Amino acid sequence: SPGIWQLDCTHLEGKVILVAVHVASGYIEAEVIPAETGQETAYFLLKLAGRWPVKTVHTDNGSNFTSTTVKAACWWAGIKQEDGIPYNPQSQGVIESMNKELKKIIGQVRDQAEHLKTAVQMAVFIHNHKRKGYSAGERIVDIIATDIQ
Amino acid sequence: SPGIWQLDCTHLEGKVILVAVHVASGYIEAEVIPAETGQETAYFLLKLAGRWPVKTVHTDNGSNFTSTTVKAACWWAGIKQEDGIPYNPQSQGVIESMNKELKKIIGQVRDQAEHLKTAVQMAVFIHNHKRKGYSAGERIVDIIATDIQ
């Protein structure tokens, strides 16, 4: 539960938005890169594992599953690197709806930002603070604190 | 308590490492930039506040306190932008000792990374996972979860 994350990569403005979703809470972290490579994915996971207690990551495609650089970052950070096959079919739909929602929010903020990366961070902020009533930012803290105790 | 962070800026390798410290726990987030500007500081705080519930930020110097762009980001994210004057004199020493310890760790990992920014995220990871006995990553989750309940 508490330590499982899923990677997700979506496209906007000719650039790539790489997202990590904490599966149990729906909390996300994201970045904009020019294209998805093993090196960028590896650095993103190293950032994520220094901030939250990442036990497993379901990678977003077979290229990042195979990547030696992603394997090296996952070894360094103590992450079990797993596939991200939707064994639960409802998963494809949940990720897709999340990408649609994030793009809708980016569009709503995009004119308040010079750079796409700012708009994506504004969307991350709105997504994690939205109350559904607890927000995803509350749920992920709740879940991890319960695990620690 | 739970929502107070302090900014800190240190130099290495001709680049700048910008750090946000959650004061109550000692947990940190950091990034490498070519130089500290209001625009970079503002984007860093937007990232921080999408990830943790940031109520107040003690800025690291008067230029980032005055910056219109830092004020805009703090307004956008609902952060109270405050000075970072060490009213408690022990604060100068605590930040200084942190920068010294982070640079020590960066030197210990630096040959495992091509880019400095990877070494700084390795240092962030080691700093936040070290047990003092709870780690700073444990303490910030505990503190925030206690606030939520």
Binding site: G38, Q39, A42, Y43, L46, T68, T69, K71, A72, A73, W76 | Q112, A113, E114, H115, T118, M122
Partner: peptide, 8 residues
């Protein structure tokens, strides 16, 4: 480059 961030 046999680095964690670039294993080439």
């Amino acid at each position: 480059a046999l680095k964690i961030d670039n294993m080439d």
